[PDB]
């Protein structure tokens, strides 16, 4: 069982470099439009009216695309180009929910650099790996050749976690695209994902945390809230149904295991090679892989 | 620090499926040759497909445990590429594939016992591992087998197994594994780069003395090639390799003491010196 990203090729063929003045970052080229963070032009609406199409330099590899129009949508700039991208996959723009996962394609100067999986934290940050020049890198999921784009990268907080927008330019979380030190809300642990990962552990032969006890949902939620875990809902219990079906361990049975781990710790033991309780795998992530 | 795979697009363009009889696995289509595990078994006995499009086989040969199928079409998506044989401790990206269709990408490290900690199901054989340097893909792994302990084993692209395994339907055991010393050292350099340097001491060691101590803690001995690849990190931090070795020796002999390095009480041994520079630079 491994943290596994989607194959990134359908997205690599869409990455370009956008330059305006002395600022450069990455853009996403779909059909005849390039999407990139509006920070590349740095009130912002007045800054944009003062630019012309020729102020924007867009490169796909070494080929310069010609900008024939421009607009702003929240924190995202949309550059119309006179060339359509033939590598454009079937795609959608989606706004993901906290606790869901996606693949990030880290890019620099329009060149894809690395790929890895992230979860949208409850406090709407992501624990990524991004350096100077990564702005405009995107996050996505792939379902049957359709790429659903959900994240465009903008900033790194003082704590080292990351913040960005959806592809409509609206931030996840209470952040803004300005050069300021910004703190996130208090983070919490994605309970449904921890349980999905414990099921993944049982499917892979790790069973030392299982116990004889069962708990009620409300009693589990009282302990979970005490340890800064998100509440578990009946919908979460349902979503875990297939994993409980495959393992023969009722969901509220697994919750009793989680409660004991939270109250007694792991005593130096590991689960799937981890000394910590992992909450960045969704129930679907476990199913899709196992 | 994240375990980061290389972008997989250059390899995705090369994945095909190879069927002989009822057995289908993945193949790697470079120029006019398709490489796949020989376990898949005349030219017309082989069904090679890119998606649902058949590629006509015009020749075949066997190189160790890999089958080489000559096809009549040169792959237009062929990247600049090399076949390389990696050493234990080196990392690479795996593109997990089923029936010629890529499924996911993740980073693996070759253990000293020549296994990797993969995520592979039935139908994954022929999936490859690779590194990408300046648009050139160095292929280093082709997947063949899951051991009874859940770890995985395979060959290079010349069909030679890493480790003492064979492509038979038989339960095989790896040697007892050890910790990848060169990678732990890279991880300590990464901690120093980020300001976490409590573990630096004022001792040094010889390479040989360190190696003999290391083996008593189930750590790998260092080669001269290991000392060489730590050079860039040593210069960046101004900490000599043998001085860092002396620091690691104290951690082995004295423990963390409820202290952390880069947030964890466990030392990490699956980031190479190149991986550390990749992520810090
Ligand atoms: C006082 O200020 C601060 C204080 C404390 C913490 C702070 N953090 C940020 C920040 O993150 N600022 C954004 C720009 C604003 C306008 C949204 C930025 O720097 N984003 C990077 C990606 C970043 C770069 C390092 N790791 C990444 O993920 C781009 O890629 C674009 O900038 P570049 O042109 O490439 O350098 C400012 C700041
Ligand atoms: C009694 O014998 C055993 C006992 C105990 C443990 C054992 N392990 C193996 C083994 O590993 N067998 C090879 C085939 C040989 C010729 C190398 C295999 O590799 N199976 C998969 C990949 C595997 C399957 C699940 N996860 C993977 O990684 C392929 O992809 C090709 O086989 P398929 O045609 O796709 O099923 C045999 C065996």
Numbering used by the authors:
A (entry chain B): 3 to 44, 53 to 300
B (entry chain A): 3 to 43, 62 to 301
Question: What text does the study give?
Answer:
The main protease (Mpro) of SARS-CoV-2 is a salient enzyme that plays a vital role in viral replication and serves as a fascinating therapeutic target. Mpro is able to cleave the bio-synthesized viral polyprotein 1ab (pp1ab) at 11 specific sites to produce a variety of mature non-structural proteins necessary for viral replication and transcription. Among these, PF-07304814, also named lufotrelvir, is a highly soluble phosphate prodrug of PF-00835231 and a first in class 3CL inhibitor to treat SARS-CoV-2 infection. In the current study, we expressed six Mpro mutants (G15S, K90R, M49I, S46F, V186F, and Y54C) that have been identified in Omicron variants including the recently emerged XBB.1.16 subvariant and solved the crystal structures of PF-07304814 bound to Mpro mutants.
The occurrence rates for G15S, K90R, M49I, S46F, and V186F mutations among 15,476,050 sequenced SARS-CoV-2 Mpro genes in the Global Initiative on Sharing All Influenza Data (GISAID) (accessed on April 27, 2023) are 0.19%, 1.34%, 0.015%, 0.025%, and 0.016%, respectively, while only 13 reports are available regarding the occurrence of Y54C mutation. The prepared samples were successfully crystallized and the crystal structures of PF-07304814 in complex with these Mpro mutants were solved to 2.29-Å (G15S), 1.95-Å (S46F), 2.05-Å (M49I), 1.75-Å (Y54C), 1.97-Å (K90R), and 1.70-Å (V186F) resolution, respectively. Two of these mutations (G15S and K90R) are distal to the substrate binding site of SARS-CoV-2 Mpro, while the other four mutations (M49I, S46F, V186F, and Y54C) are located in or nearby the substrate binding site. However, the electron densities for mutant residues S46F and Y54C could only be traced in one protomer of the Mpro. Though four other substitutions, namely S46F, M49I, Y54C, and V186F, situated nearby the binding site of PF-07304814, no significant changes were found in the orientation of PF-07304814. The P2 NH forms a hydrogen-bonding interaction with the side chain of Gln189 in wild-type and mutant Mpros (except Y54C). In Mpro Y54C-PF-07304814 complex, the hydrogen bond between the Gln189 of mutant Mpro and the inhibitor can not be observed. Gln189 of SARS-CoV-2 Mpro has also been identified as one of the hot spot residues in the interaction with inhibitors and a hydrogen bonding with Gln189 may enhance the potency of Mpro inhibitor. The binding energy values between PF-07304814 and these Mpro mutants are − 8.9 (V186F), -7.4 (G15S), -7.4 (K90R), -6.8 (S46F), -6.6 (Y54C), and − 6.3 (M49I) kcal/mol. Specially, the binding between PF-07304814 and Y54C mutant is much higher than that between PF-07304814 and wild-type Mpro, which may be due to the lost of hydrogen bonding interaction between the Gln189 in Mpro Y54C and the ligand PF-07304814.
